[PDB]
Design a protein around this ligand. Structure first.
Ligand code: ZNH
Ligand code: ZNH
Ligand code: ZNH
Ligand code: NA
Ligand SMILES: [Zn+2]
Ligand SMILES: [Zn+2]
Ligand SMILES: [Zn+2]
Ligand SMILES: [Zn+2]
Ligand SMILES: [Zn+2]
Ligand SMILES: [Zn+2]
Ligand SMILES: [Zn+2]
Lengths: 157, 157, 157, 157, 157, 157, 157
C-alpha cells in the first residue's frame, strides 16, 4: 500500500536512531559486564533488545508502505569511558531520538497515516521509559556517590 | 443504631487524620519510586493501604451509628523534599494521630461505646507499628549515614 | 524529563478530579452497603478503586515530568441522600471530569506530549465506561420503578 | 451438481429472510445490552448466531447446486423502540419466514430435491423454537407486567 | 451520553462499509471452499469474522452515544468470478473503507471524541493488515503463476 | 414386520448400487496407493467404507422387513486407467445411484414406509457429499493442470 | 589480559563483517516475509540471530583482551531486488567473511592466542553451514524453476 514519501523518510530517520542505539547500548552492556557490573549489563542488554524490536517495527512498516529500509547509514556513536559518561551519553541519544519521534508523530497525523502515528506513539512511550531509568540512575550516582553506586551493581537484580 | 454524638465527632476527626495520611504516604511512596528507592516505595505504599483500611473502618462505623462521615475536609499535608524530611513528616503525623486516638479511646469507654473503643485500639496498635518502623529508619540514617542508607533502598526486600 | 508547565497544570487538575471521585464513590458505596444494597456497593467500590488507579497514573506522570502532584486541594463533594440522587451526583461528576479530560487531551497534542495524551485517552475510556453504567442504572429506575430497582440490588451479581 | 432453478430461487429467498433476521436480532441484542437487560442480550445474540449458521447452510447449498447466493438485496427491518415492540417485530419476522419455509419445503419435495428439503426442515425446527421463546416472553410481559418483567432481565441467566 | 451528530453519521457510514465486507468476504470464503481451496476459505472466513467484530463495535458505540445504528442500507457488493478477481475486489473494498476511516478519525479529533477516534484507529490498523495480506496474495499469483498458486491453496495451513 | 414388496425391491436395487461402488472405490483406492497418490488413496478408501456402511443398512432394513437381501448380482464396474478417467467414472456411478435413490424415496413415501424413506434420505445426503468431492477434484485438475494436481496427492492430508 | 594488537585488529575486522551480515540478513528476512515467503523469512531471520551471537562473542573477546570494539564503521550492504539476487548477495558476503576468518585463524595460532583461534574456528563452522544452505537453495532454484521454488516457500517448515 503506497505510503507518503515523507512519512517513509521519517521512518528511515527513526530507524537510523534505533540502529545507533542498538549498537551503543549493546557495547555499553558488555563493557559493564567486563567490569563485573552485572545489574547494569542486564538492564543495558535489555534496552538494546528493545531498540532491536523498535527497528523491526520500522523496517516492516517501511516495507508495507513500499519504501526501502535504510540500514546502510549508521550515525555517530558516543561510547564513553566511565559509568557516568556512558549513561549520560545514552540519555543524550534518547532525548534526541524523542525529539525526532515527536516531529514525525505530528507529521504522520497531518497526512492521516494514523497507523504509523500510533506505532510511533507506542515506541515513544518505551523511549520515555528508558529516559526515566537513565535519569534515575544518574541521580542515584550523585545521591549515594559513585563508589556506593558501583557496589550496588555487582549482583543481578 | 444511634451512637453518641461526641463519639461520632471523634470518629470523623480520626477519619480526617487517616485521609491526610493516605494522601501523604501515597505521594511519598511514588516520590521514593521515582528516585529508584524501591524498598521505601514498597513500605510507604503498604502504609498508605493500611490507612485506607482504617478509613474504611471509620466510615462504616460512623454510618452504622447513624452519623455522616466527613470526607470533605482535608487537613494539612507536609510533603517534604528529601528522604529524611519526608520520613520525619510521616512520623510527626502518626504521633499527632496517636494522641487523638488515645483521647477518643478514653472517651468511648466513658460512654460505654466499647465496640468503637475496641476498633480504635486495633487501629492504634497498627499506628504504633508505623511509628516503630519510621523511628527505626530515621535511626538507621544516623548510624550508617545517608549515602549507605540510600544504597540499601535500591532493591526490593 | 522536564514537562510542559501547562500540561503539568492540567495533570494536576485532572488529579484533583480523581481525588473528589475517590472519596465520593467510596462513601456512596458504604452508604449502599449500610442500606444492604450489595450490588450497588460492589460496583461503586470498584469505581472508587478505578479512580484510585487513575490518580496513581497522574501522580507518577507528574513526577516523571518533574512537577509537584497536588493532593492537598480537594474540590466539593456532593454526597446526596437517596439512591437516585447519589447516582445522579456521580454522573454529573463524571461528565465534568470528561470535559476537563477532553481539554487536556487536545492541549497535550498541541505541545507534542503524545504519551500524556495516550495515557489520558485510556483514562477517558474508563470514565465513559462509568458514565454508561450510571446512565443505564438511572434509566432502569425510571423503567421499573424505584421499589423494583431496590429489590434487584439486595444480592451480589 | 446442477440443481433446480426454482429450488435455488427459493434458497435465495430464504437466505434473504435470514440476512434480515441476523441484523435485526443483533441490533435488538445490543439495544437490550445498552439498556442493561443482560438476559435479553444473551438470548437475542444467540438467536442472531443461529440465523448466521442458517445463512451459511443456504450459501453452501446454493453453491453446491451451482447457483449464485444473493447477499446483495436486504429486505426491510422493523426495529421498534421498546422491549415489547421489538419482541413482536421479531415474532412477525419469524412467522413470515416460517411461511416461506413451508412453501419451499413442499416444492423441493415435488422436484425430488430431498436433501434440500431435509435441510430446510431442520431450519424450520430452529425457527419454531425461536417462535416459542418469543411468544412465551410476550405472554410473561402481560402476566407479570412490564416493570416486573424488566427487573427479571437485569442479570444473566 | 449524547454524542456528536456528525460522529454518529460517520460511525453509521463506517458500519455500512463493514456490513458490505461481512457479506462479500463470507461469500468469497464459501466460494473458495466449494472450489477446494481450503487455505483461502480459512483466511477469508476469519476476515469475515473480523469485520463482524468491527461492526459490533460500531453498533455498541452508536447506541452509547444515543444514535440509531443503520443496518438497513447495504451498499454494493462486487463478487467476481475467479480467484484473482475476487481478491482484487476485496482489496478495492478495503482501500475505500480505509479512506473513509481516515476522514472519520480526523473529524472525531476535531470535535474531541477521542474514544471514538481511538476505536477507529484500532479498526484501521486491522484493515491495513487485511490490505497487506490481499496485496501479498495478489503478488504471489503474478510471481509463481495462477496454477502453482492454486495448488498451494488445497491444504489448510 | 412384513414390508412392502416394491420397497424391498428398491432396497435391493440400491444395495446393488452400493456393492458396485464398494468394489470400484476400493480398487481405485489401491490403484492410487500403488501409484503413490496417498491423498487419493485415503479419500477413496474412506468412500469405500462409507458405501459398505450403506450396504449394511440396506441389508438390515431388508431383513427387518422380511425380504431376502441380494448380494449375488453385481452390476458393471468401470475401472478406468488414468486418474481423471477414474474420478469421472466414480462421479457417473454416484449420479446414477442418486437417481435411483430419488425414485425409491418418492415411492417409500407413497406406501407410507417413512422409516425406509428417512434412511434413504440420510444415504442420499452422504452420496451428494461424495458427488461434491468428485466434482471439485475434477475442477482442480482443470484449473491447475494434471501435473500440479498429481504432485499435490503424494502426501497424506 | 593484554591481547596481541594485530589479533584485536582482526577481531575488529571480523566484527565488522558480522555487523554487515546482521543488517543484510535481517532486511532480507523481512522482505521475504512481506512477500509472503514465510519459509525464507524464518531461515534468514535465524541467520541474522547467528551473526548477532557471533558479534557478541567478538565484542566480549576484544574487551577481555583490552581492546576497543569498533561498532561505528559499517561496511557496504548489497541488498538486491529479487530472491535469487538476494541469496547470491548473502552467499558472496559469507564467502568474503570466510576468507577473512581463515586469515585471522592462521595468525592467532602464530602468536599463540589459541583461545581466540578456537573461538574463530567455531564461528567458521557456523558460516560454512550458512554457505551450504545458501548454495543449496540457489541450486534448487535452477533445478525446479523459480515459480516452483517460490511456491515451496509459502508455508513454514
Ligand atoms: C541492527 C539491526 C538489528 C535488528 C533489527 C535486531 C533485532 C533483534 C530481534 C528482533 C531479536 C529477538 C529478540 C526478542 O527476544 O524479541 C534480537 C536478538 C539478539 N540480538 Zn539483535 N538486531 C539487530 C542488530 C544486533 C547487533 C548489531 C548485535 C550485536 C552487536 C545484536 C545482538 C543480539 C543478541 C545477542 C540477541 C539474542 C540472541 C538470542 O536469541 O539469544 N543484534 N535482535
Ligand atoms: C480517601 C479515601 C480512600 C479510602 C477509604 C480508600 C480505601 C482503599 C481500600 C479499602 C483498598 C483495597 C486495598 C486492599 O485492601 O488491599 C484501596 C486500594 C487502592 N487505593 Zn485507596 N482509598 C482512598 C483513597 C485513595 C487515594 C486518594 C489514592 C491515590 C492518591 C488511592 C490509591 C489506591 C491504589 C493504587 C489501590 C490498589 C488498587 C488495586 O487493587 O490495584 N486511594 N483503597
Ligand atoms: C450477514 C451474513 C452473515 C453470516 C453468514 C454470518 C455467520 C457467522 C458464523 C457462521 C459465526 C460463527 C458462529 C459459531 O461458530 O457459533 C459468526 C460469528 C459472529 N458474528 Zn456473524 N454472520 C453474518 C453477519 C454478521 C453481522 C452483520 C454482524 C454484526 C452485526 C455479525 C456479528 C458476529 C459476532 C460478534 C460473532 C462472534 C465472533 C467471535 O468469534 O467472537 N455477523 N457469524
Ligand atoms: Na414488583
Ligand atoms: Zn528504540
Ligand atoms: Zn491509619
Ligand atoms: Zn478516573
Ligand atoms: Zn434462521
Ligand atoms: Zn473491519
Ligand atoms: Zn453408499
Ligand atoms: Zn556470522
Amino acid at each position: 500500500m503506497k505510503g507518503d514519501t515523507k512519512v517513509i523518510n521519517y521512518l528511515n530517520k527513526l530507524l537510523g536512531n534505533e540502529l545507533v542505539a542498538i549498537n551503543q547500548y549493546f557495547l555499553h552492556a558488555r563493557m559493564f559486564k567486563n567490569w563485573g557490573l552485572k545489574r547494569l549489563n542486564d538492564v543495558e542488554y535489555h534496552e538494546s533488545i528493545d531498540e532491536m524490536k523498535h527497528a523491526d517495527r520500522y523496517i516492516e512498516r517501511i516495507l508495507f508502505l513500499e519504501g526501502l529500509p535504510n540500514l546502510q547509514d549508521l550515525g555517530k556513536l558516543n561510547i564513553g569511558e566511565d559509568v557516568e559518561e556512558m549513561l549520560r551519553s545514552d540519555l543524550a541519544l534518547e532525548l534526541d531520538g524523542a525529539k525526532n519521534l515527536r516531529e514525525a508523530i505530528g507529521y504522520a497525523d497531518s497526512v492521516h497515516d494514523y497507523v504509523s502515528r500510533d506505532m510511533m506513539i507506542e515506541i515513544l512511550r518505551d523511549e520515555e521509559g528508558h529516559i526515566d531509568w537513565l535519569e534515575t540512575e544518574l541521580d542515584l550516582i550523585q545521591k549515594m556517590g559513585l563508589q556506593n553506586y558501583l557496589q550496588a551493581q555487582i549482583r543481578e537484580e
